[PDB]
Amino acid sequence: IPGDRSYTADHEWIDIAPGAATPDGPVRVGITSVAVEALGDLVFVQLPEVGETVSAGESCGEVESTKTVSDLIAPASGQIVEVNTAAVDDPATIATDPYGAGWLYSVQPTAVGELLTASEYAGQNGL
Amino acid sequence: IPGDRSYTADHEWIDIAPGAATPDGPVRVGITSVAVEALGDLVFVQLPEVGETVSAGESCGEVESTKTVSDLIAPASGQIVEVNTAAVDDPATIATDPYGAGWLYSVQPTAVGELLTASEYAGQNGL
């Protein structure tokens, strides 16, 4: 659980350093290693469209394994700027590298929901 | 993670002790605390019917939160002897006590799938 980003109780991360101001630029969002182990082998991923406005705490897509369908819950309100199409196309990549090449989208934030540090999130997950 | 029972890579348990002969009695199945953490607050459970024959590794029911639907994958082949109507009627009970009052059903096993010890299952999930 990289201490270089922030996390949600719903097992996502957003690349705002904990304590930091929300950047004057697009920040990537993804799922945690704990979500990967929860889900199993990923088979389908549905992302918001580039240019859509999402809201913190609202369901804005899904990740899906052979056994589980799980809603993506936006860590931040804002406009979607990029989607990681390599991730959608080869969802096995998300499981390989959830904090790196497996990022799911980037958002330009106007607001953030409840965010946890890596320590707080690790603690919620018995780590 | 109670050391007294067996676990699957899909985040269930079954009350067969490590190295125990597959028993003459019915044994309980349920989900692990890792499963609960991942799912969130549970709002709906679908279990197999009493009298139904299930197959190890086959999807035999479902647990559901507001954000996730997740298939129950049978740890064991066998006949469903009993279901926890209490947990189906009050699924919050499952999050509160996944290894005790939150058990889901009991099965009379004729076979078992891949099972893991408490420690092996802990090691896969970094606990």
Q: What is the residue extent of each domain of chain B? A: 1-127
State whether A71 and B67 contact (CB < 8 Å).
yes
A122 CA to chain B: closest CA distance, Å?
A: 10
Q: Can you tell me whether residue A28 is helix, strand or coil?
A: strand
Closest by CA position to B85, among listed B106, B58, B114, B71: B106
State how far the Cα of A60 lies from the Cα of A62, in Å rounded to an integer. Answer: 7
- Residues paired with B6 in a beta bridge: B14
Q: What are phi and psi of B118, to 5 degrees?
A: -45, -45
Q: What are phi and psi of B111, to 5 degrees?
A: -160, 160
State how far the Cα of A37 lies from the Cα of B32, in Å rounded to an integer. Answer: 13
State how far the Cα of A92 lies from the Cα of A44, in Å rounded to an integer. Answer: 9
The secondary structure of chain B in percent helix, strand, coil, rounded to multiples of 5, reads 20, 35, 45
- Residues paired with B31 in a beta bridge: B12
Stated in angstroms to one decimal place, the resolution of this structure is: 2.3
State whether B40 and A10 contact (CB < 8 Å).
yes
What one-letter code names the amino acid at B106?
A: S
Closest by CA position to A74, among listed A29, A123, A19: A29
- Residues paired with B27 in a beta bridge: B107
State whether B68 and A68 contact (CB < 8 Å).
yes
- Which tokens go with A12? 């996502």
Are the beta carbons of B74 and B58 closer than 8 angstroms? yes
Among chain B, residues having any CB pair with chain A shorter than 8 Å are 9-11, 33-35, 37-40, 59, 67-71, 73, 124-127
- Residues paired with A46 in a beta bridge: A62
Closest chain B residue to the Cα of A67, Cα to Cα: B71
Partner-chain residue, chosen from A67, A126, A127, that has the shortest CB–CB distance to B73: A67
Are the beta carbons of B60 and B104 closer than 8 angstroms? no
Q: Can you tell me whether residue A46 is helix, strand or coil?
A: strand
Sheet hosting strand A105-112, strand order edge to edge: A6-7, A12-14, A27-31, A105-112, A76-83, A53-54
Count helices and strands in chain B by DSSP H and E runs: 4, 9
CATH of B1-127, one of 3.40.50.300, 3.40.190.10, 3.40.50.2300, 2.40.50.100: 2.40.50.100
State whether A127 and B124 contact (CB < 8 Å).
no
Beta-strand relationship, B42-46 and B59-65: antiparallel
State whether B11 and A127 contact (CB < 8 Å).
no
State how far the Cα of A88 lies from the Cα of A115, in Å rounded to an integer. Answer: 25
Are the beta carbons of A116 and A61 closer than 8 angstroms? no
- Residues paired with A83 in a beta bridge: A105
State how far the Cα of A11 lies from the Cα of B42, in Å rounded to an integer. Answer: 16
Are the beta carbons of A126 and B37 closer than 8 angstroms? yes
Q: What are phi and psi of A37, to 5 degrees?
A: -70, -35
Cβ of B21: how many Cβ atoms within 10 Å? Answer: 7
Are the beta carbons of A9 and A32 closer than 8 angstroms? no
